[PDB]
Every structure is written in C-alpha cells, then in structure tokens.
Amino acid sequence: MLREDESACLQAAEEMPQTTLGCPATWDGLLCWPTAGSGEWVTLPCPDFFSHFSSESGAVKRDCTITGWSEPFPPYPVACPVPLELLAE
C-alpha cells in the first residue's frame, strides 16, 4: 500500500546527509526516487499496484540535471495506465 511506501521513503530520505551531490531522494506521491548524481537518470518500474493491471513492470524515469530533478517521464497516465472502467471510460 502507498501510505507505507510513503512512510518508508520519507523516513529513509531523513537518513540522508544535508549536503548531497546531485539530486536527493524524493517521494513524488507514487514512487521513491533514489538519490542520484548530476547527469544520471533513474528508471523505476511502476508501483506494485500495477501487477493487478499489467504483466509488465512499467518504466518511469527522472533525469538528475544540474538544475534539479526533471519531472517523471512519461507522465503517470502513460507510464502506469489504469483500466478505463476506473476512469469511467
């Protein structure tokens, strides 16, 4: 469940140093992004609820640039699509 993942992420995140190089670890509502260095990107699978909707693990990515993290790509509607009957489509 997402509340527990959230609590794991946000607590781990507290154990990180105040000064990191690159991009610090971050919870974005759905996924815990691990710390990364400038010029690295991190690819994660969809959260675990996605196995009820797909055999594929999915792929979501964030680039760690020198101005900070990029937005997750592709957007979550695209990266981790839910059944249309849950959208009322």
> Residue 46 carries which side chain, given as an amino acid letter?
C
Q: What is the strand order of the sheet 60-65 is part of?
A: 40-44, 60-65, 68-69
Q: Which is nearer to a copy of itself, 41 or 49 (CB)?
A: 41
Q: Which is nearer to a copy of itself, 37 or 48 (CB)?
A: 37
68 binds a copy of itself (CB under 8 A): no
How far from chain centre, in Å, is Cα 3? 14
- Contact residue for Mg ion among 21, 41, 48, 68 (CB under 5 A): 48
The answer to whether the beta carbons of residues 50 and 57 sit under 8 Å apart is yes
61 binds a copy of itself (CB under 8 A): yes
For a copy of itself, the binding residues (CB under 8 A) are 38-41, 61, 63, 65, 73-75, 78-79
For Mg ion, the binding residues (CB under 5 A) are 1, 48
